[PDB]
């Protein structure tokens, strides 16, 4: 949410996509290779956090016949301490993972932006709101070439440099 | 040309290092709250003790007649269970319970104690079978006839097996000194037990107690764990409940206390008194005293983990 | 045009994952070290026991005459406190202390024990009131006249209330067997106590002890917790300190041990023996044994958290 | 502390500010909307860390009459273990939070820099030390327009492109 | 591993280096001041993690003569709980530190890239794969000047702007 | 001109928050697995008890004759150690062991107990020295001649030193009541001990036990910790093993149990039964019960920390 003042609620096909507007018409198509990268990383986080322990813990209390009061107070004291430790670890873990997730998605967006920028060396100029100004009407074949990273950086240059 | 990211009209608020209430596209729960109100025992040898108390399986009251040599991966104690028919209790009872919960079951072996000069068929109406009986694994040693004395006795048992043996005996405390004389004669009675790890005699103590099952006498149950080839000896002169069979631990198991039904249709490794916790989440807010292989208990009822990007709608 | 950030001449060094001693613009402390040398009790029902020991509030030595039915949210034990006037001690004393600390106070009720055939007004000079007295909640049972025997007695108390009752009795150990005969007669004495959770008799034991308050005898204090509608019975023949009133827990409270004064001007939920820890910081380096609602104790005396940016001056 | 070889000790009005130098005169004015962002995030960290627990812990020791030696050694063993856990958690927490704070401020500075850069499309060029070279004398009205993000990216273009 | 589709296995002299190719010849020389920065930060991580505790823990068990079964089960229960806490802390610590290490090296690479980019204002143009296109044959003295950050940004300008 | 980073043909896979198996240039281990199979005692006063049991150093069986006043920074218990020569055991033995492990050694002082009217030279063949002896720090009190009675005795010891004194006495349980009469006379025997913190008498208990070292009698060992200027008294009439010397803790030390040799060539602060853990790593996967100053035990055998960048080869 940097220079992109908002998101596209109509982009139901992916996480990151393109929305062009030349003289031929309109177009909005998701970028699968960045969406799949962020999705892969979130999937990895879920694989590391959704975890099963192989450590078995046994009963040291008794709900039906209460144990000695002193040893029961030691047991309750220890259990409460461990509960505090795990509540802290859980809260901190969730907060940190969420921070890194948000920053990760933002980073993916920015790196995609600068990639498309480096594809258009001097034939385009940054507008300041996440869009690129082309100084020559790029048709839809040129659009598809921009998407799959095949647009030629010099076979459209001179024409745009004049403009 | 413009490039951007997706968004939704209604997202999920989460918490971060910086804020509390950040809208994200998608989020999932990390703290488990859904509980199955059954004991999921699919694929495990399960023994529901019911009216039999766990310690009773060693002494054998009538409610434990069918649990004298049980074998289990999962042992379930019930609230209606009872270790005794004649009123009494165990010394170091909870340690023995924790021993028996992970025992994997018990295997009994006759200790081969033979008697000459005393009676051996003490019974009572509280331990009801056909008529009046007693603990199936114990023997109530008394005097010959109309009172009379109890001779100083010494019986020895040697553990010939490669695993520790559970030995349990009992000291009888009658309702009066007159009844103690009637059963075993007058004079101070003394019960001495020794081995390699053990060294503790007991002294009886007659007197009036509150009537439990209409009876004022109490039976103290005691136990030691003999080591292989180690020998234990009892030197007793009365007020003695002799062990007839010793116990041996079968293998390994888990013990739980619950009040819900057994279900062989679901599988679970995390149990509590209210059922089974089946979850892949790392945390749970159901029961802090859950046992087995559980997610760690936390006090927060919900901790949402972000699975999507920041949500910024128009 | 140039754009940049701010800086200061003197910043604060902090530690990160990477370095130790990074200058930042601003930083704040996370480990609490400032302690208030008072017991901040503003808004809490506070009972400073002073010279009265916490357990004494159950038995009632002269220093606890004004604490027999106290009511508190916060209970303070003092170093000069004493549970006894006649020399003796409690069995399972620390468990009873921990029970009474979170009890919220105690409410006494007459147990209604009446006697025929014995004396009931035993006193001593160590429990000084007007003249020579005894524990206010107990009764020193003796024999009728010049020695003579103590008849075998059986007294029963039934808890008619919906909360567990604290029952406390005492076994007297005189300085000699001759004094034991003088008080209760010759022969072996035996005190038996039973209920539904309980099963334990006691035997006296005369002999010479070091003189505490000029006295060589000792009084063993014992206690059990009766359940509602459950009944307890005592079968005794001498050397017995009978309970006159039973105790009931009022509600909930907290217990601390301290040596600083009470202050109703400050409020605090974290207490230690040196005062009160009032802080919003998540950690503290004051007392690892602090109780209540405290920041977690850490060994580091200081951990500076960065609240500003990196400081890079000219 | 990237291309800005040092900071401005004279900037007492905010965290991030501008310092221009055209022919009209001098000027140093803080940027409130980025300073307030970093301040808001640090404030959030302090709100999450300054925290009060509602878990009450009771006495299981006794300073006036020492408890049984064995149960006291178990109690001391457990308390020492928990103390080690919380000292570790405190040190790691402080270090990680400090790292993220420093990187956060640096990130805010960089994003501000690239924002001002995108405002000046071709009418200015990067100098290499965090400053921007304007190829036309921009007066102070143009400076205030640069600050509040209203400077026109094309109504000063041709003149600067000639230079 | 952004626009640099792979790394240089032949760069044995440092972590980050230059590889130029003009008409004079070849050249690959490590950049010591960024390699030393990343190395210094990793060294700091190792200094903080390689740590010795001054907390002594005593025996509360007995391997030769087993203690009471109940107190032994409480002891084993507590020890297992603490072991779980420390295994979790160790796994999470290692994973987080590795993430921050990788992102740290990538960040150093990117910042170096943008530094060299800001040295070449208009005399060069980004190619899109981590390389820079010079529009005038820069000799090896100019290369060494580019490395030690002394290349003049305007005393080669006009010639390259024509091309 | 192009700028980039280094790479290698074969890197090391590590784990992150996101992936499991990421190749990096260089990585180092954080979990220690290398163990030294020796007790590294370089620079420490070490006492290897060997055949002497730790508790024996207080009572003094023949195997502990050279450990009666040891002084150590590091105390090593061995599996072949024994606290006793005459068969018996300690009450609260593990607490006393934990006290003696961190004691720094012991310093003995004669308690100065003198006797009139009884014998004092009880011996046995199990405690073999020149001929038949007994515990060096204890005295076996018996009756004068052919049986006869044991007079009611009262002996007092006052701790005149500024540190707590370790007091240890013994109650003899013979193989029969006939042997108990032969040693100390007929009638009930009673041993009473009291101080300021203490209050507990003992009663003997003859009977047959399994023969250990060819002997059926047992000796119960008991101990209390007197405070400075506090006085302890014993009131005994037989079956009593009197203390001749009291013990005082020297300072501070550490106690370990091991079966490996002592090495004064390596230094270490983390010990376990299999040797010494010498490491700078924060974690270890060797022994969860290691003691001293150790890396924290974890269940993972390896956790690789990245020390290099991401490895992306051609
Ligand atoms: C420990 O807590 C449980 C509930 O979690 C409670 O039932 C029990 O009474 C407590 N133990 C003692 C000794 O009060
Ligand atoms: C949203 O998160 C849930 C978590 O259970 C997941 O199952 C689902 O696939 C996610 N949806 C998308 C579109 O990623
Ligand atoms: C146990 O005793 C038997 C017979 O005396 C002997 O053969 C065996 O080796 C012993 N084993 C152990 C473990 O003591
Ligand atoms: C510096 O930090 C302290 C922390 O207590 C805070 O109160 C103060 O407002 C901060 N100062 C500035 C200028 O942010
Ligand atoms: C207690 O006893 C009274 C009278 O026998 C009875 O009315 C009441 O229901 C009982 N309550 C409980 C909880 O036992
Ligand atoms: C436990 O530690 C306290 C001090 O924190 C000390 O006073 C006490 O003696 C220790 N417990 C034992 C059993 O030594
Ligand atoms: C505790 O665990 C150890 C092994 O770590 C085991 O030898 C011991 O028997 C366990 N304690 C009990 C009471 O079973
Ligand atoms: C690789 O890591 C090890 C860790 O022990 C270190 O000793 C070594 O110097 C490192 N190598 C390089 C080239 O950094
Ligand atoms: C101990 O007693 C001696 C002699 O009665 C006395 O001088 C000394 O002050 C006392 N010290 C303590 C600590 O009780």
Tab-separated table of N, CA and C in Angstrom, chain D residues 31-75:
chain	number	residue	atom	x	y	z
D	31	UNK	N	8.691	16.941	7.700
D	31	UNK	CA	7.588	16.294	6.998
D	31	UNK	C	6.753	15.541	8.029
D	32	UNK	N	5.550	16.049	8.301
D	32	UNK	CA	4.769	15.555	9.431
D	32	UNK	C	4.161	14.182	9.166
D	33	UNK	N	3.855	13.858	7.908
D	33	UNK	CA	3.097	12.643	7.631
D	33	UNK	C	3.951	11.380	7.621
D	34	UNK	N	5.270	11.499	7.471
D	34	UNK	CA	6.141	10.338	7.625
D	34	UNK	C	6.645	10.203	9.057
D	35	UNK	N	7.044	11.327	9.660
D	35	UNK	CA	7.375	11.347	11.079
D	35	UNK	C	6.238	10.775	11.913
D	36	UNK	N	4.997	11.131	11.574
D	36	UNK	CA	3.855	10.615	12.319
D	36	UNK	C	3.629	9.134	12.045
D	37	UNK	N	4.048	8.643	10.878
D	37	UNK	CA	3.927	7.217	10.593
D	37	UNK	C	4.906	6.410	11.436
D	38	UNK	N	6.186	6.793	11.412
D	38	UNK	CA	7.175	6.095	12.228
D	38	UNK	C	6.853	6.221	13.713
D	39	UNK	N	6.438	7.415	14.147
D	39	UNK	CA	6.054	7.617	15.542
D	39	UNK	C	4.862	6.739	15.899
D	40	UNK	N	3.906	6.606	14.979
D	40	UNK	CA	2.746	5.756	15.232
D	40	UNK	C	3.153	4.295	15.373
D	41	UNK	N	4.111	3.845	14.560
D	41	UNK	CA	4.530	2.448	14.636
D	41	UNK	C	5.316	2.165	15.915
D	42	UNK	N	6.244	3.057	16.281
D	42	UNK	CA	6.952	2.902	17.551
D	42	UNK	C	5.967	2.931	18.714
D	43	UNK	N	4.990	3.839	18.654
D	43	UNK	CA	3.945	3.889	19.672
D	43	UNK	C	3.205	2.563	19.762
D	44	UNK	N	2.935	1.935	18.617
D	44	UNK	CA	2.297	0.631	18.640
D	44	UNK	C	3.157	-0.430	19.299
D	45	UNK	N	4.460	-0.428	18.997
D	45	UNK	CA	5.373	-1.352	19.668
D	45	UNK	C	5.329	-1.162	21.179
D	46	UNK	N	5.374	0.093	21.633
D	46	UNK	CA	5.313	0.362	23.066
D	46	UNK	C	3.981	-0.071	23.664
D	47	UNK	N	2.887	0.073	22.911
D	47	UNK	CA	1.590	-0.361	23.415
D	47	UNK	C	1.513	-1.876	23.533
D	48	UNK	N	2.180	-2.603	22.633
D	48	UNK	CA	2.162	-4.059	22.712
D	48	UNK	C	3.109	-4.588	23.782
D	49	UNK	N	4.230	-3.906	24.024
D	49	UNK	CA	5.204	-4.396	24.992
D	49	UNK	C	4.902	-3.943	26.416
D	50	UNK	N	4.561	-2.670	26.616
D	50	UNK	CA	4.065	-2.231	27.917
D	50	UNK	C	2.745	-2.956	28.137
D	51	UNK	N	2.784	-4.029	28.923
D	51	UNK	CA	1.641	-4.917	29.060
D	51	UNK	C	1.512	-5.371	30.504
D	52	UNK	N	0.270	-5.527	30.950
D	52	UNK	CA	-0.043	-5.972	32.299
D	52	UNK	C	-0.685	-7.350	32.232
D	53	UNK	N	-0.205	-8.263	33.068
D	53	UNK	CA	-0.746	-9.611	33.119
D	53	UNK	C	-1.846	-9.699	34.168
D	54	UNK	N	-2.855	-10.520	33.879
D	54	UNK	CA	-3.927	-10.797	34.824
D	54	UNK	C	-3.765	-12.161	35.488
D	55	UNK	N	-2.579	-12.757	35.388
D	55	UNK	CA	-2.299	-14.051	35.995
D	55	UNK	C	-1.666	-13.834	37.362
D	56	UNK	N	-2.366	-14.250	38.411
D	56	UNK	CA	-1.859	-14.120	39.769
D	56	UNK	C	-1.057	-15.362	40.133
D	57	UNK	N	0.122	-15.155	40.711
D	57	UNK	CA	0.955	-16.240	41.205
D	57	UNK	C	1.053	-16.151	42.720
D	58	UNK	N	0.910	-17.295	43.378
D	58	UNK	CA	0.889	-17.363	44.828
D	58	UNK	C	2.235	-17.835	45.368
D	59	UNK	N	2.357	-17.769	46.687
D	59	UNK	CA	3.556	-18.221	47.375
D	59	UNK	C	3.564	-19.743	47.452
D	60	UNK	N	4.659	-20.351	46.996
D	60	UNK	CA	4.949	-21.756	47.253
D	60	UNK	C	6.232	-21.943	48.048
D	61	UNK	N	6.890	-20.858	48.440
D	61	UNK	CA	8.061	-20.875	49.303
D	61	UNK	C	7.687	-20.334	50.680
D	62	UNK	N	8.703	-20.185	51.531
D	62	UNK	CA	8.517	-19.587	52.850
D	62	UNK	C	9.856	-19.005	53.281
D	63	UNK	N	9.923	-17.677	53.374
D	63	UNK	CA	11.169	-17.010	53.731
D	63	UNK	C	11.439	-17.058	55.229
D	64	UNK	N	10.394	-17.176	56.049
D	64	UNK	CA	10.557	-17.144	57.498
D	64	UNK	C	10.841	-18.521	58.087
D	65	UNK	N	10.203	-19.567	57.566
D	65	UNK	CA	10.445	-20.942	58.001
D	65	UNK	C	10.629	-21.794	56.749
D	66	UNK	N	11.875	-22.164	56.464
D	66	UNK	CA	12.187	-22.865	55.226
D	66	UNK	C	11.433	-24.187	55.138
D	67	UNK	N	10.920	-24.481	53.946
D	67	UNK	CA	10.147	-25.694	53.703
D	67	UNK	C	11.086	-26.892	53.650
D	68	UNK	N	10.524	-28.075	53.394
D	68	UNK	CA	11.321	-29.285	53.231
D	68	UNK	C	12.411	-29.073	52.186
D	69	UNK	N	13.588	-29.646	52.452
D	69	UNK	CA	14.752	-29.378	51.614
D	69	UNK	C	14.567	-29.919	50.202
D	70	UNK	N	13.955	-31.098	50.067
D	70	UNK	CA	13.790	-31.693	48.744
D	70	UNK	C	12.785	-30.908	47.908
D	71	UNK	N	11.600	-30.646	48.466
D	71	UNK	CA	10.602	-29.873	47.735
D	71	UNK	C	11.097	-28.451	47.499
D	72	UNK	N	11.936	-27.929	48.399
D	72	UNK	CA	12.530	-26.624	48.175
D	72	UNK	C	13.538	-26.625	47.045
D	73	UNK	N	14.268	-27.730	46.877
D	73	UNK	CA	15.205	-27.832	45.764
D	73	UNK	C	14.474	-28.015	44.441
D	74	UNK	N	13.347	-28.733	44.449
D	74	UNK	CA	12.531	-28.824	43.239
D	74	UNK	C	11.959	-27.458	42.883
D	75	UNK	N	11.451	-26.736	43.885
D	75	UNK	CA	10.881	-25.410	43.652
D	75	UNK	C	11.942	-24.461	43.105
